[PDB]
């Protein structure tokens, strides 16, 4: 609805009880799964009940996190990315051209529709309830007539925006449909020659209205809220940072009607039985702690000690041990009584290794997968497993290349057009030439009247660009043009043969 | 039937004896199977008869639940999802268009019919007696004439709703058919700028009537009931929370006739011989306790101790041990009498590991399945096993993508239509191109008069979108249109050849 | 008291004998084998392996 009343910080900052209960565990699971440099070793210490801090810091120095949960998330994401997502064009309402233009860039991250959906799936995989919002661009003009309003309505260019889970504050939703939702957004105004400024926005999305309350030039607090705000009247009118007032510091709402007729947000919710991160994160933090303890034990018991029993006065004993040390090598025969090389045998280290291995095995068996594939015709399956991640990175590379080519075309002064279609980086396979040859042959064995010229042109072009590489773009273009002309001639010949 | 009498909280809150006996064990089994962060380590302690709480908390810190029961439930759900569920359209009574419109979204969670049925099956799998209710949307108007009533009757849009088992209070049912059922429903009124309010509803569904008794602005108790209720007259008329009265706090029923002619609920009841969760949950909690004890023992006996026998006065002994510690490395030869590296051998740790392994093996053999698949042509079976969960997540992804595309179409101002059919994410297989080629060839080898053009178009479009990926939607649309035109021409040509 | 305090990787104790006493385990696998043979009989009552 239409809000026009300023609200104090306490009213904006409220969080529903269910979200208050759920956000901490989601943050913990996300921190465990993501790993990386954000991990704090202090939080994952199996310390023997507050021993000396020196040994604690020495143990912390040996922190080597093995994020097997991150590996499992990566594996699931790559496997799901290996699938195919398709849209039937004829079922799209309205003009198809605008749909294609939108599908050129579905979001501000330039990813394609499949890439965006896979990213949403990954975000839900690490922590459920991935939220997406669909919005437009804003255009404002004065002295607006009916034609100007018509143009403004006709110039809408929607795009997607992934709302972080931790930024969600409250939402009313029945089943999967969301009646309304209020979340937070910390937006940083970056100055090229000054300190970064921060603003805090509280966005409430309703059935037919969207509203934002903005606090300007604030300081973010350790709880994710506002700690200090700017006050120009402060400092005898010069302005300074003062503590936030929960009853007197009010933000004026700015609202407008999106005319969507429904809340323009969608929540993807991974099923509880499928959400595995909830059941392995504790195992992952146990792995962190156990690995730290294991490395500390190995370091503190890894050296080899060599003791003696002198052969027959503390000064005399000092003289003896000095001599012994000096003559302790291959080029001397010592005169001692017992000089065993004392060494750790090692049965507890492999015990802890086995414990960590079984924790990793449980992590990888939470999903029905066997880690023995990477523990110790046939290997073609592993090659295809690698090709899956290769295809994912190839899709990302193709998106980046499309953006780069668009910018390059803009550099020449050309206005782009067709967004420069780019293919490839999608079929990683050993011995690919004869696979393309087999594809060509199978296509040609089909009833020629049933094969469009475009498919043959595409397959032949793929073969041409596979057979010759490292060649100038001119050479490939010439070969492709010759192929196109020849295929057109052959298709026309077979068509006229079939006609009579 | 028609109820019009207010009832005290005691009358509403009654629970039948069989439900009173069955709900606790169902809750225990569900908690054991789901696992996750909801697990409380205190409940799964094999404590040595009340030892010091410090060691108890130290042991609790090493709680790493391995929910093998959750893995088994996930495996069964995925395997069942791998099947095919089909509806014969011609057998549907009434108009088919309304059936298709309903099947676009069978419930508020946007899942399809197969997805909803699989979710019901999963809920029954973790705990039997999954209850589903079929309801409509509510529309109320004044000064209603006969035409208005006709429109209200004709504007019914049914959907499904899964009633939680723990919310069931009493039901009269013969066999599988349910004569009537009274359950509870805690509905939270969320305020975007205020504390969440709670209401408690008791819903009685009868043969031809449905009734609800509602208590407003209540506090949920630890037993799932009502503890405190709001009272506006309290606080000298300002209102406050007061304890619930079991004889004087009465809720006014609101009832209406659904005219279904029978109770609009269905109970899915997994057969006792098939319900395995009843026979492994104790093993799962035993696994929890044993794993906690095993990790505690390993941590307390995992370090390596190194003792000496000094070579020849407590102060002198202190001086000696200080010196020894300083010179205990690779760059020194110590002068001691005995310096063994004492270490745990480890036979009890592997004993407990074997015990936990045999418990897990029993859990996985409760269903006729072998866990050795993930313990240590041929591997294609394991790849297909992975593809099963891939297909499940793909179905979920396709549902989410359909919802997102519907919202996007609404953003353009289009009124949707056909719900934007989306396919894919259903065939995960190594080397997929030649499989589609084989499908195309086998289709074309069939009697051409018996193959509709739509099937050929679909298969060729699948091949086209598989051969080229990462390309602009425009390119795929152009290729598909060319394929459609060519296939139409070929079909017409073969038809006219067959005619004469 | 002193011994307990200095019983870790970061200390060299001055004792005379500090073995880590642990159960070897031969009876546990014996009972496991007995239960396994009972299960094998249960599954061989029907002609199944």
Author numbering:
A (entry chain D), B (entry chain C): 1 to 312, 332 to 395, 404 to 527
C (entry chain B): 341 to 389
Paper lines:
A-1(L) is a Myoviridae cyanophage isolated in 1970s9 that specifically infects the model cyanobacterium Anabaena sp. PCC 7120. Using cryo-electron microscopy (cryo-EM), we solved the structure of A-1(L) tail machine, which consists of three parts: a 205-Å-long neck, a 1045-Å-long contractile tail with a complicated baseplate, and six pairs of tail fibers. The dodecameric gp2 portal, the pentadecameric gp5 and the hexameric gp7 sequentially constitute the neck of A-1(L), to which five neck fibers are attached. The long and contractile tail of A-1(L) contains 24 rings of gp10 hexamers that form the tube, surrounded by the sheath of 24 helically stacked gp9 hexamers.
Twelve gp2 subunits form a dodecameric portal with a central channel of 25 Å in diameter at the narrowest tunnel loop. Notably, we observed two extra densities: one in the central channel and one around the wing of portal dodecamer, which were assigned to two segments of the dsDNA genome in our model, respectively. The dodecameric portal is surrounded by five major capsid gp4 hexamers in a 12:5 symmetry-mismatch pattern. The wing domain (residues Met1-Tyr275) of portal interacts with the A domain (residues Ser178-Asn282, Leu353-Gln365) and P domain (residues Asn22-Arg177, Leu283-Asp352) of corresponding major capsid subunit, forming a circular cleft that accommodates a segment of the genomic dsDNA. The dodecameric portal/gp2 forms a channel for the passage of genomic DNA, whereas the hexameric neck/gp7 provides an interface for the docking of tail. The dodecameric portal/gp2, gp5 pentadecamer and gp7 hexamer form a symmetry-mismatched neck, which are perfectly accommodated to the 5-fold vertex of icosahedral capsid.
